[PDB]
Amino acid sequence: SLNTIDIQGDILVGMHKQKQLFYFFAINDPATFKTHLASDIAPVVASVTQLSNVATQPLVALNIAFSNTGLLALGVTDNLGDSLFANGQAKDATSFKESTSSWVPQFAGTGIHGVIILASDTTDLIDQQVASIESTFGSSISKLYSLSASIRPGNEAGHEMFGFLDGIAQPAINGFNTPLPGQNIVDAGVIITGATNDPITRPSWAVGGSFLAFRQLEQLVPEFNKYLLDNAPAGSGSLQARADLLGARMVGRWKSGAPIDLTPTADDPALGADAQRNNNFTYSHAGFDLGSDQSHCPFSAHIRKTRPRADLGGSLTPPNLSAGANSIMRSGIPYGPEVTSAESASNTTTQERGLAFVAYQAQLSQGFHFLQQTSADNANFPPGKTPATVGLDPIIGQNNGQPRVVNGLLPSNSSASLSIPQFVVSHGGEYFFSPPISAIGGRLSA
Ligand code: HEM
């Protein structure tokens, strides 16, 4: 019953283009905006069906999403069923132990009405599409802010700015995806509003959409690299190899993608590259106490925080299916320049770079907001551990600018604690609703 022809492609497939632009806009003269929304945008919005087929990847892939104030600007006063969306991300900031005082000023408010996501293999093609939009909409659309993003170059293609292969793990949608070994399998309504087993009643025109949580997350890459070298556990290999082990313990995967739960002391690049094997784990190991054993993967490791698997019950053998309702689909892409020679040499960031983080979910409170607040920022999550104080997620965990206490990272002693400065700095973002395609030229243009 999942009508993928009507679902925007970034939600379930991803744009998978070299370059992306996030174009954050305001609406003036809504009657004019609406005419062009229907005539100029709706026909070129890329669907899941379109992106699922090579023969039909468009030259420029385009998606569009609206904030609460953007829907209101279009005269849409309906309750979409999500209080977090309605209130906007700025009002949610304190839930994550940050302040909007640190944000890009355009995000610290509700002036942004929407985002157009443009993706293409060159920036020139994106620019041409933006020029076309500005030409036909005229002054009815106004750019408030934008952020350019790119797949990283060379041997870092598909890796985020710290160097780790990204985009490996996603929930499988039951009835749509063919699940990979170890992959969680969830009802479509966890991700798509109004789809199977979404318990929240939605406006009819909104069935087939998703909520988009956007975060501009700066990464302090030279600082991270230097921290790992300075805190590398003693051992037989090179200093860099031991630093790499510590980084892998923090993320829960080696940079190659190999999950540490399956290879806890050394990388396995072949495993990392193999989608049939690189997700096939639950954190359980026969003969080890799940509640205390951190020898395979720390309880505080990023991926263990964000998908706890057996830490939240369910099958000890793959696939673990726990906490399906707390799943998110991720379509983030790195932004900013590569690390420059001088920054690396000084172990100091000068230019801003990071992750243009994008999460899709049908309930913000169950997805992004939950994972940040209840897990990453919670020293006592996952529950039931010994010792009980897991500490914060070393990658994304926040405590109002203070160093984060993170336990279990050191293989030699699970009781050893590290106090870690932030390596990821929030510059804010917004919550949007990516409508079904039918609503774009339909209700939203009416
Ligand atoms: C700059 C910030 C971030 C970086 C560098 C980062 C990096 C990574 C990496 C390297 C992985 C493992 C690769 C993969 O499984 O695809 C991962 C997985 C994941 N991340 Fe993060 N991430 C960031 C922000 C976030 C945030 C803010 C959240 C949610 C609040 C989040 C949620 C997840 C989830 C759900 C997974 C998959 C877990 C699983 O299914 O096993 N990430 N991330």
Side-chain angles (χ1 to χ4, degrees), residues 1-235 237-446:
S1 74
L2 191 67
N3 193 20
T4 54
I5 191 70
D6 205 30
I7 300 175
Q8 291 195 61
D10 195 44
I11 300 165
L12 297 183
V13 183
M15 302 301 221
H16 296 287
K17 297 289 196 176
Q18 288 297 309
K19 308 295 179 179
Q20 293 196 17
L21 179 69
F22 297 91
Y23 181 101
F24 298 100
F25 65 88
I27 299 164
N28 295 313
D29 187 14
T32 294
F33 185 95
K34 286 169 174 282
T35 298
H36 293 281
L37 186 63
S39 67
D40 307 339
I41 294 294
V44 303
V45 172
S47 73
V48 168
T49 299
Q50 279 176 327
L51 297 193
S52 290
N53 182 351
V54 296
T56 56
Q57 309 283 311
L59 196 54
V60 181
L62 186 151
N63 277 191
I64 188 166
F66 294 90
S67 68
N68 175 71
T69 52
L71 292 180
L72 290 166
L74 295 171
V76 178
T77 58
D78 303 356
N79 176 14
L80 276 68
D82 197 288
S83 293
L84 292 176
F85 167 72
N87 283 322
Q89 196 186 116
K91 285 187 178 67
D92 206 21
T94 52
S95 297
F96 309 134
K97 301 193 179 177
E98 74 194 57
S99 171
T100 59
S101 63
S102 60
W103 286 18
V104 176
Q106 293 96 308
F107 290 140
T110 57
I112 290 168
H113 288 161
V115 60
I116 303 176
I117 304 178
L118 304 99
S120 195
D121 287 325
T122 71
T123 57
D124 287 342
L125 287 170
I126 291 173
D127 290 346
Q128 189 165 109
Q129 185 73 50
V130 170
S132 175
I133 290 166
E134 291 181 352
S135 173
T136 61
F137 278 78
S139 302
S140 72
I141 197 168
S142 174
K143 181 179 69 179
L144 297 178
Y145 180 61
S146 67
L147 187 67
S148 296
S150 181
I151 302 187
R152 293 189 62 215
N155 62 14
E156 297 296 335
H159 298 229
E160 53 68 53
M161 283 288 177
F162 291 143
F164 294 78
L165 183 62
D166 193 14
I168 297 169
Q170 305 282 14
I173 301 303
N174 188 41
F176 174 66
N177 293 113
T178 299
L180 297 163
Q183 194 176 17
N184 207 351
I185 302 166
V186 308
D187 293 322
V190 171
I191 304 302
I192 302 298
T193 53
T196 296
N197 293 341
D198 175 11
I200 311 304
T201 296
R202 311 298 182 169
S204 46
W205 57 262
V207 174
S210 188
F211 296 101
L212 191 176
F214 180 88
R215 303 275 285 165
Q216 181 174 320
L217 301 179
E218 174 180 15
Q219 294 172 253
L220 302 180
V221 180
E223 290 88 346
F224 173 82
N225 290 344
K226 179 61 159 41
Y227 184 90
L228 297 181
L229 287 164
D230 289 345
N231 291 273
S238 69
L239 178 57
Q240 188 64 65
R242 293 185 285 114
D244 293 344
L245 171 62
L246 182 57
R249 297 279 290 179
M250 291 184 181
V251 172
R253 296 185 180 276
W254 296 91
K255 283 175 174 182
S256 69
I260 70 181
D261 195 55
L262 295 185
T263 183
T265 60
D267 189 19
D268 183 339
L271 168 60
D274 187 351
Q276 289 291 312
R277 302 189 300 116
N278 67 13
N279 216 19
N280 197 30
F281 60 94
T282 66
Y283 299 121
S284 176
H285 301 274
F288 290 85
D289 173 24
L290 186 70
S292 63
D293 173 41
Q294 299 190 74
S295 69
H296 305 86
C297 184
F299 299 148
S300 53
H302 178 55
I303 64 161
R304 188 159 186 164
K305 285 275 201 173
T306 61
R307 185 189 169 203
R309 307 186 194 216
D311 286 347
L312 286 180
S315 184
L316 300 180
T317 58
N320 177 272
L321 304 174
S322 80
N326 305 115
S327 305
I328 61 171
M329 284 295 299
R330 294 177 299 123
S331 298
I333 178 169
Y335 75 92
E338 292 287 307
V339 177
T340 65
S341 298
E343 286 171 293
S344 188
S346 65
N347 303 307
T348 304
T349 291
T350 291
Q351 293 185 64
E352 192 185 338
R353 57 182 60 83
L355 184 65
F357 172 91
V358 175
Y360 294 102
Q361 61 264 282
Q363 296 181 246
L364 284 163
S365 71
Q366 305 302 291
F368 163 70
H369 170 116
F370 175 87
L371 295 175
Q372 187 71 55
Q373 176 184 57
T374 291
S375 177
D377 294 352
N378 184 352
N380 290 93
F381 189 96
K385 301 309 194 176
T386 303
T389 310
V390 167
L392 304 192
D393 181 315
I395 305 304
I396 60 161
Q398 293 186 155
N399 193 23
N400 291 121
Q402 303 183 303
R404 294 88 40 68
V405 170
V406 184
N407 298 329
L409 294 176
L410 300 178
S412 75
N413 178 2
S414 66
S415 295
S417 189
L418 292 174
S419 181
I420 313 185
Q422 286 189 210
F423 294 125
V424 174
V425 178
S426 175
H427 294 248
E430 185 55 279
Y431 298 145
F432 306 88
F433 180 66
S434 290
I437 294 168
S438 54
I440 300 172
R443 175 68 186 91
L444 303 182
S445 293

